[PDB]
Design a protein around this ligand. Structure first.
Ligand code: HEM
Ligand SMILES: CC(=O)N[C@@H]1[C@@H](O)[C@H](O)[C@@H](CO)O[C@H]1O
Ligand SMILES: CC(=O)N[C@@H]1[C@@H](O)[C@H](O)[C@@H](CO)O[C@H]1O
Ligand SMILES: CC(=O)N[C@@H]1[C@@H](O)[C@H](O)[C@@H](CO)O[C@H]1O
Lengths: 100, 457, 108, 80, 94, 96, 79
């Protein structure tokens, strides 16, 4: 135990597999699905969420996120190293694979 | 719409996608226990939930072995055997069945690089950071071998691995997090370190993978490269971001990583405003060349939040302890904006349904911070858990000697940047804060280096 | 003569650097006062004020109020270890006390 | 001129309730009155000294604040 | 009428920075004024003592930094120090 | 109907730990302050703020003393506070 | 280095005897060691801050005296 294991195994004595790689995420809150088990919201058309229709994510991005580029305001106290280090640290922390 | 596909349906009057039959590609995540129906779906973390410099050393043993240099006894890390930037090492190449780097430009014919992560070649800036880390590890190994010649290659590799891990931890927790959370949130969620605590779960939460995408709001729409005088380097001083995705050939054949680092150090970021969330380059032209159609990064964020089955905005507001709005007026009070609250209500219908990314990036930023109260709560909690649950924390007793701690506490990003490549003029103090040339730049012939003399065995 | 700009604007502060410099000079602290001491003092004072005001505003919001009263300042100070250590021997007027009851006295 | 009895038993009981006290013995009240008189005597003596040095005849709030700060009992809200 | 100086407008500006829609009463402003004066006097007195100990006749930013280190407890001190430095550097650039 | 002993006491504890007002009547306290100050100087005047500040300081002091007294009483495996607890708290604090 | 055990049980017994204590429970030695460690940590931290401000590498008696005095523990006899 002079150095780290590559997989991060046996870091915690109580639960050696806790904190390692290729395991499930921790849910701080119970997951909500449109069927209750594994069906994402918006899978079946016409299913209302809490009495309200499920919005199209592309539509939300179109109305709310979209803004004309020509009035971009630069940050007066941050550099692009801020964004780069954020991305690098994120690539350290987590990566959720998906089937090919 | 069949598994494992969860495409994004195109709404009417879409400014870019006129054909309503077309759908943005999207694949659901890998289940934790496939083949079950009585168990709730959970996702898999493919990487170690620790700040252990795992972007370059790999998280799986076969890949970790493949990354090292086995053709010597210096314990180095393999670099590219065919290309060098002014006599300096580059990332080793990778072979894949379908390589997007080749698809970006057939004439150049440079494949994607290989590192501890498969995403290390999305843009030249990430590749530059990876190459800088690799060069730093190699230089540390060389100086440790000169310092201690009796040492074996495995010992040198492990020692440089520990040094780089502690370096990443120090830089992050000392410079990056205070500039994200701000003084109040950083002091609340990351108090003074006490000691290791095994009763703390260091596993990455599900919401964090969606709550750490705030950086999508800091992306500038252009890539900037600067010469040795921090002037616009020709050719192509500024390049659209749609043409730099997976363009690994822009690293080998376009002057190396020095102009990219120089542009990063001396360019202001983008300020997140309630009416300017994200630029159109990543919203309508993301991965334009590789994919059949451009992607929508914010829409991908909300769709992935839905796919993971994360709760709504109000659930997280209650979880963190903040007041939960219910009506239009309460939402406008919380967001300190009335137009945005009206738009959110007209698109979702209730604050309980707003996605975590939308609520997180639509909140007003903290004082001297770049995230709202909810994102600050989530991020501070996650990083406190990561620090307090890591048994190999650089400040933990026994991991490093006292003199080693004093030597490590003096490291800095500008020292590494101007020590591992050809740039001489670097920013001072917090590199993440200095973005004006030449008002806040130095020659880095004044700032001290890393004193390895405490590593004598 | 150019347009006069305050020293606190150059340092990017809200607290007055010039007034703090005058108070340091007139306060009989030392024979000479450096050029950077007022900036440092103003920055520290503004930081402490912002911290305590943020905590008090959060306490007021938790009470469904809009205006900060001394009760909220007391609740902010006494619920924070560092601020409670800084203000251990300080009384805040109309602040009240922190609600606690010893476990022995509760019915069992 | 026995105004020390103006601090009634219900007032002392309320002050004890704010301090978290559930049951109070019967002899607590005289002891509390003596303690309060001692504290007031010290503070008022210091305040009157401060007032007399200024050649004034009214005891201002700032004199009380300075007298309290002398004993190590800084008070916020009155004066500056 | 003689002018009475106070730290009221600056405290109000900071409050508007932190909580843009939250007001403050008069007793709370008096308390904040007393707090600012108390902390100023504490730090300045410690800095003066530090200057006198080392047989110096100037109060510099190093004396203020050491006084902040001595007086403010734990994490507070660290953050305060950062803020102070963050100002002086900026003040030097302009 | 009648509540058991110690119930209204706990209700009062919860009530007076939420308020911020002053628990001593103002006129008797003002008379006491004037009587005490009579022994130092004759024909003295008081600002209203002076008497209010004295009242705030005295009430805070007494509340803190009663907290320490309650701790001392609980130490001896008791629920009532006796004068010996006040004396012990004051002696440990350094006041006597 | 576990030098806190260098403050032995008989030394703590002597310090208690000077304080007038007649009978001593067997669990106060660890408590006394913790109390002493906390006190020493505070005083030594202040003394080292005073030393570092003067750009020195030796902790003088005046630094300790000032560190004690600023905690309300004035000590007479060392300048
Ligand atoms: C600057 C250019 C960037 C580009 C082109 C980019 C691109 C992408 C894309 C296409 C995804 C997958 C979308 C999805 O399915 O969720 C992704 C994932 C992600 N990105 Fe970025 N990103 C950038 C910067 C950043 C930054 C600065 C951060 C954080 C500070 C960040 C954090 C994340 C996170 C947390 C994920 C989720 C990882 C996962 O769930 O597997 N990205 N990025
Ligand atoms: C160190 C590295 O990354 N790659 C090296 C390469 O440069 C070297 O020529 C070869 C033989 O020593 O071993 C491998
Ligand atoms: C339109 C475009 O991207 N052209 C580039 C060309 O300038 C470069 O010389 C070549 C090989 O690197 O790759 C391609
Ligand atoms: C000895 C120690 O620090 N134990 C801590 C405990 O205080 C805390 O409640 C728990 C959950 O965070 O983690 C553990």
């Amino acid at each position: 135990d002079k150095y780290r294991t590559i997989t991060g195994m046996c870091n915690n004595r109580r639960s050696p597999t806790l904190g390692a790689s290729n395991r499930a995420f921790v849910r701080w809150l119970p997951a909500e699905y449109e069927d209750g088990f594994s069906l994402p919201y918006g899978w079946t058309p016409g299913v209302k969420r809490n009495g309200f229709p499920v919005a199209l994510a592309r539509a939300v991005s179109n109305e709310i996120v979209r803004f004309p580029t020509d009035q971009l305001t630069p940050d007066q106290e941050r550099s692009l190293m801020f964004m780069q280090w954020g991305q690098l640290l994120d690539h350290d922390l987590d990566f959720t694979p998906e089937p090919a | 719409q069949q598994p494992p596909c969860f495409p994004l349906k195109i709404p009417p009057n879409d400014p870019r996608i006129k054909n309503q039959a077309d759908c943005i590609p999207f694949f659901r995540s890998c289940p934790a226990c496939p083949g079950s129906n009585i168990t709730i779906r959970n996702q898999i973390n493919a990487l170690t939930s620790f700040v252990d410099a795992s972007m370059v050393y790999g998280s799986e043993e076969p890949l970790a072995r493949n990354l090292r240099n086995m053709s010597n006894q210096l314990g180095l890390l393999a670099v590219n055997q065919r290309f060098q930037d002014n006599g300096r090492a580059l990332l080793p190449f990778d072979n894949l069945h379908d390589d997007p780097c080749l698809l970006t430009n057939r004439s150049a014919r440079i494949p994607c690089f290989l590192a501890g992560d498969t995403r290390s070649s999305e843009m030249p800036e990430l590749t530059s950071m990876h190459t800088l880390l690799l060069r730093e590890h190699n230089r540390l190994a060389t100086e440790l071998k000169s310092l201690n010649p009796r040492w074996d290659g495995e010992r040198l590799y492990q020692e440089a691995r520990k040094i780089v891990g502690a370096m990443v931890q120090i830089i992050t927790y000392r410079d990056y997090l205070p500039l994200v959370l701000g003084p109040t949130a950083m002091r609340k969620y990351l108090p003074t370190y006490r000691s290791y605590n095994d009763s703390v779960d260091p596993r990455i939460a599900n919401v964090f993978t969606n709550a750490f995408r705030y950086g999508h709001t800091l992306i500038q729409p252009f890539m900037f490269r600067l010469d040795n005088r921090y002037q616009p380097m020709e050719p192509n001083p500024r390049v659209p971001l749609s043409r730099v995705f997976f363009a690994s050939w822009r690293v080998v054949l376009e002057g190396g990583i020095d102009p990219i680092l120089r542009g990063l150090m001396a360019t202001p970021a983008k300020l997140n405003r309630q009416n300017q969330i994200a630029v159109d380059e990543i919203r309508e032209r993301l991965f334009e060349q590789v994919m059949r159609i451009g992607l929508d990064l914010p829409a991908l964020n909300m769709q992935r939040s839905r796919d993971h089955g994360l709760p709504g905005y109000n659930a997280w507001r209650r979880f963190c302890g903040l007041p939960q709005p219910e009506t239009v007026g309460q939402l406008g009070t919380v967001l300190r904006n009335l137009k945005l609250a009206r738009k959110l209500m007209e698109q979702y219908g209730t604050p309980n349904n707003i996605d975590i990314w939308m609520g997180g990036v639509s909140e007003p930023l903290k004082r001297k911070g770049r995230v709202g109260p909810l994102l600050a709560c989530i991020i501070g909690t996650q990083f406190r858990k990561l620090r307090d649950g890591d048994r190999f924390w650089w400040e933990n007793e026994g991991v490093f000697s006292m003199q080693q701690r004093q030597a490590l506490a003096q490291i800095s990003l500008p020292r590494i940047i101007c020590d591992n490549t050809g740039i001489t003029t670097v920013s001072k103090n917090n590199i993440f804060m200095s973005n004006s040339y030449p008002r806040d730049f130095v020659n880095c012939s004044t700032l001290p280096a890393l004193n390895l003399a405490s590593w004598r065995e | 003569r150019a347009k006069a700009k305050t020293r606190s604007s150059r340092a990017g502060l809200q607290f007055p650097v010039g007034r703090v410099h005058r108070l340091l000079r007139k306060g009989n602290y030392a024979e000479r006062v450096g050029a950077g001491a007022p900036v440092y003092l103003a920055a520290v004072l503004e930081y402490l004020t912002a911290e305590i005001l943020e905590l008090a505003g959060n306490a007021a919001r938790d009470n469904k109020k809009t205006r900060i009263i001394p009760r909220h300042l007391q609740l902010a100070v006494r619920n924070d270890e560092e601020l409670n250590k800084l203000l251990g021997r300080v009384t805040i007027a109309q602040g009240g006390v922190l609600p606690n009851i010893q476990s022995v006295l509760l019915p069992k | 001129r026995d105004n020390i009895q103006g601090i009634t038993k219900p007032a002392i009981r309320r002050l004890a309730r704010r301090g978290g006290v559930k049951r109070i013995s019967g002899l607590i009240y005289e002891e509390t009155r003596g303690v309060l008189k001692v504290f007031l005597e010290n503070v008022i003596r210091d305040a009157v000294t401060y007032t007399e040095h200024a050649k004034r005849k009214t005891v201002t709030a700032m004199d009380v604040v300075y007298a309290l700060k002398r004993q190590g009992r800084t008070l916020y809200g009155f004066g500056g | 009428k003689t002018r009475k100086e106070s730290y009221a407008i600056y405290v109000y500006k900071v409050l508007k920075q932190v909580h843009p829609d939250t007001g403050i009463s008069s007793k709370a402003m008096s308390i904040m004024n007393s707090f600012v004066n108390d902390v100023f006097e504490r730090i300045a007195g410690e800095a003066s003592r530090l200057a006198h100990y080392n047989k110096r006749s100037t109060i510099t930013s190093r004396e203020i930094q050491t006084a902040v280190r001595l007086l403010l407890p734990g994490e507070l001190a660290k953050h305060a120090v950062s803020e102070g430095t963050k100002a002086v550097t900026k003040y030097t650039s302009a | 109907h009648r509540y058991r002993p110690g119930t209204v006491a706990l209700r009062e504890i919860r009530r007076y730990q939420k308020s911020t007002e002053l628990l001593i009547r103002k006129l008797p306290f003002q008379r006491l302050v004037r009587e005490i100050a009579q022994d130092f100087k004759t024909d003295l005047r008081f600002q209203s703020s002076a008497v209010m500040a004295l009242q705030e300081a005295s009430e805070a002091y007494l509340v803190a003393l009663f907290e320490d007294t309650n701790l001392c009483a609980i130490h001896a495996k008791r629920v009532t506070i006796m004068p010996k607890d006040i004396q012990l708290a004051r002696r440990i604090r350094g006041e006597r």
